[PDB]
Design a protein around this ligand. Structure first.
Ligand SMILES: O=C(O)[C@H]1O[C@@H](Oc2ccc([N+](=O)[O-])cc2)[C@H](O)[C@@H](O)[C@@H]1O
Ligand SMILES: [Zn+2]
Ligand SMILES: [Zn+2]
Ligand SMILES: [Zn+2]
Ligand SMILES: [Zn+2]
Ligand SMILES: [Zn+2]
Ligand SMILES: [Zn+2]
Ligand SMILES: [Zn+2]
Ligand SMILES: [Zn+2]
Ligand SMILES: [Zn+2]
Ligand SMILES: [Zn+2]
Ligand SMILES: [Zn+2]
Ligand SMILES: [Zn+2]
Length: 737
């Protein structure tokens, strides 16, 4: 019966033989402080007692990073904005964005450089924030959310696993290993990762996640494929179900939400109803990228993962910024289509589809920066108009919005009903009660130290690293198959490889990695060439209103067409405009003056929009916004210096479904592997034969740029193209002895 309580500001009070927290400091026990009652009564009693300002502060979630004290050397102190956020704007939801790791030696507190904090320091911080949260009138606790933290970047003190697609690769391979085919995967893998993730996240007081992504990799040109698990909706649905089950728990509430005091991380799945199918793979962070198009009519397939997660009881949902072009309303009259606005602002999507068609009973967390920079379809509207559109659309809380007064102003102008704010407040409080945060919101900082990156947890990560590796090609020489490596030999390395780790497996290693001026050693006479390569975008120079870039007619036009519901095409998106024209800094359609460029610098990722279909390595070499690392020119020199290319072994990281074009020569390598982020002991363990490769492609790889241009952004695979797939979904070799 009696749950554990902790209180740093308020007092505890003995009642009816049990203990309770006196969170309103009134000396008697309110129903909302009475953990014996079911959540609906505590919420109802709590909302009853809340100011108009208290209820609307819940509808904000913003960054609240740990700071350091430059005079004391202490890390994990509140920043300056904490006071204004918790006391003035009455916020209880934050995004924690610091890296968690051991700081190198000599690293002292600077100022305002979002510091790296240790596990104990991070928990110190979130405890401090809860202490200030408890200091409010009603002592409502806070929830922190964060983007993912347990994936290698080709980190911190969080246990390192491969990237999302790498986890699916491991799950497909483990199914194949034990059954024979790779369809929906073996979720024992997924559960193991999520279990390590849960304990580590909860141990530092981080109980929410902006994620995981339920999006599908159906458009290889979408830069966000790097955070996608698969292109297969049905595999996606099983991973989502498993993530929710492991991270949130399997006890649902009467309301159908997987929420309990043992819920370690409540998920806010994203990006509803599916960020994947982007026209030309252009991303709707950017004005040119507003469109989501569905040539194969797969809109329903893309939200299957969300239905799986909703049915398992996901806590929260983030709609995307995209605009669903010409998409039949689900469960609606023939001919009816969803509004040509960003999902976050379309009531038919956040209330129609999500809640009435799909049955979701939780809250809706907007994506970040919609009201000011990305209210697609509301380019003309004002900010209060945009806020009201989202809230009345069904969004309950706004990420990156920090002026509570605007919400209150809209209520006092009857632009938002009080029932609606009450309805938000209800949905936002429900998880906090169920997750036990009204009983104890604190954590032990010593225990984060023993938890984040514990040896056993990193063991699970290394296990998944080795099972994520996909072996795509393995020439059979006259001396046998290229992989596994024979013992000993001269090995040439190119690309990010730690020489000592390769060397410790018994090879004498030449390093082809040199500074830009220095003379690269030749590769001739090597027994093995280990190349580790990838492709990266370098588009920081993009500017929407530069006649050399965004408004350069020599860069083509934006074939994307979104006809607004005012009967008009949206600016820059009529089908014959310059790439930079969709940006507000060109069309100016805002109620503002001399507006700034949203798209400048392409800070979030992605190539120049006119280069987004260049996924073949030879093109990427020659492109302006693409860089092959290491240079394809260096690789080709190296693959020649060894006169048999069967001695070459390519570890490729497929950040996006890159295309090994036949002209590049990379298919001449003796073995090709797809890695999804792994340490070099993991990679060398597999290469030298200590473990055999078992992962399977969680997405298909094409062998022609042409197939990239023809494929259907909403459709998996390349089976509908003239050239087809180089490697299908679910492919992967092993060794056989
Ligand atoms: O963290 C946030 O507040 C949210 O930011 C939003 O925009 C970004 C997208 C990509 C990157 N990036 O790749 O750098 C940075 C920001 C995302 O749509 C959302 O998924 C995320 O949860
Ligand atoms: Zn009583
Ligand atoms: Zn009380
Ligand atoms: Zn409050
Ligand atoms: Zn199922
Ligand atoms: Zn787009
Ligand atoms: Zn009134
Ligand atoms: Zn443990
Ligand atoms: Zn030696
Ligand atoms: Zn020209
Ligand atoms: Zn150019
Ligand atoms: Zn496709
Ligand atoms: Zn052809």
């Amino acid at each position: 019966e009696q749950p554990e309580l902790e209180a740093r500001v308020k007092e505890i009070i003995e009642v009816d033989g049990y203990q309770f927290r006196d969170l309103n400091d009134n000396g008697e026990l309110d129903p909302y402080e009475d953990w014996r009652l079911p959540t609906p009564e505590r919420v109802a009693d709590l909302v009853g007692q809340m100011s108009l300002v208290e209820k609307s502060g819940l509808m904000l979630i913003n960054t609240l990073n740990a700071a350091c004290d430059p005079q004391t050397g202490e890390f994990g102190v509140l920043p300056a904005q904490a006071d204004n956020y918790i006391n003035t704007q009455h916020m209880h939801r934050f995004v924690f964005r610091n890296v968690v790791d051991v700081r190198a030696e000599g690293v002292e507190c600077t100022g305002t450089g979002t510091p790296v904090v240790s596990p104990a320091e991070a928990a110190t911080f979130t405890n401090a924030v809860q202490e200030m949260s408890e200091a409010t009138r009603l002592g409502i606790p806070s929830l922190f959310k964060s983007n993912a933290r347990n994936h290698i970047d080709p980190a911190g003190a969080f246990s390192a696993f491969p990237k999302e697609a790498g986890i699916a690769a491991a799950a497909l391979g483990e199914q194949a290993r034990r059954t024979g085919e790779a369809t929906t995967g073996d979720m024992s893998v997924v559960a193991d990762f999520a279990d390590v993730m849960g304990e580590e996240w909860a141990s530092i007081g981080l109980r929410g996640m902006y994620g995981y992504m339920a999006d599908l990799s159906t458009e290889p040109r979408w830069y966000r494929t790097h955070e996608t698990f698969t292109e297969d909706a049905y595999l996606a649905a099983e991973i989502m179900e498993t993530l929710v089950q492991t991270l949130q728990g399997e006890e649902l509430t009467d309301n159908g939400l997987a929420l309990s005091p043992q819920t370690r991380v409540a998920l806010t799945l994203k990006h509803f109803p599916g960020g994947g199918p982007q026209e030309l793979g252009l991303d709707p962070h950017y004005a040119f990228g507003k469109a989501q198009v569905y040539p194969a009519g797969r809109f329903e397939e893309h939200f299957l993962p969300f239905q799986a997660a909703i049915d398992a009881g996901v806590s929260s949902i983030m709609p995307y910024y995209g605009v669903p072009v010409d998409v039949p309303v689900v469960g609606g009259e023939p001919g009816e289509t969803y509004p040509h606005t960003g999902f976050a602002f379309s009531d038919s999507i956040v209330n129609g589809l999500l809640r009435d068609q799909l049955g979701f009973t939780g809250y809706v967390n907007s994506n970040t920066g919609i009201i000011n920079d990305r209210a697609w379809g509301l380019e003309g509207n004002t900010v209060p108009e945009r806020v009201a559109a989202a809230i009345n659309g069904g969004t309950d809380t706004l990420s990156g919005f920090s002026d509570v007064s605007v919400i209150t102003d809209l209520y006092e102008a009857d632009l938002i009903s009080e029932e609606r704010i009450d309805l938000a407040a209800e949905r936002l409080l429900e998880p906090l009660f169920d997750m036990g945060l009204f009983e104890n919101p604190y954590v032990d900082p010593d225990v984060a130290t023993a938890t984040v990156g514990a040896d056993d947890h990193r063991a699970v990560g290394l296990d998944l690293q080795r099972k994520s590796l996909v072996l795509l090609q393995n020439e059979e020489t006259d001396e046998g198959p290229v992989l596994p490596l024979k013992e000993g030999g001269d090995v040439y390395i190119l690309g990010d490889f730690t020489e000592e780790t390769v060397e410790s497996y018994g090879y004498e290693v030449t390093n082809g990695n040199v500074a830009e001026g220095e003379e690269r050693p030749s590769a001739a006479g090597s027994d093995y060439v280990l190349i580790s390569m990838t492709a990266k975008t370098n588009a920081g120079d993009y500017v929407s209103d530069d006649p050399s870039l965004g408004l350069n007619p020599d860069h083509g036009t934006n074939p994307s067409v979104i006809i607004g519901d005012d009967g008009e095409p949206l600016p820059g998106l009529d089908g014959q405009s310059l790439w930079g024209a969709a940006d507000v800094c060109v069309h100016k359609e805002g109620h503002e003056e001399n507006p700034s460029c949203t798209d400048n610098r392409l800070r979030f990722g992605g190539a120049y929009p006119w280069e987004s279909s260049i996924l073949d390595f030879t093109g990427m070499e020659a492109a302006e916004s693409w860089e092959v690392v290491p240079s394809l020119e260096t690789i080709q020199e190296v693959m020649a210096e060894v006169e048999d290319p069967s001695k070459v072994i390519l570890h490729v990281y497929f950040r996006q479904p890159y295309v090994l074009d036949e002209e590049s020569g990379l298919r001449d390598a003796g073995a090709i592997l797809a890695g999804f982020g792994m340490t070099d002991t993991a990679l060398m363990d597999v290469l030298t034969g200590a473990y055999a490769p078992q992962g399977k492609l969680p997405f298909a790889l094409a062998g022609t740029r042409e197939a990239i241009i023809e494929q259907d952004s909403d459709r998996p695979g390349y089976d509908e193209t003239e050239d087809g797939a180089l490697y299908p979904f679910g492919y992967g070799l092993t060794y056989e002895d």
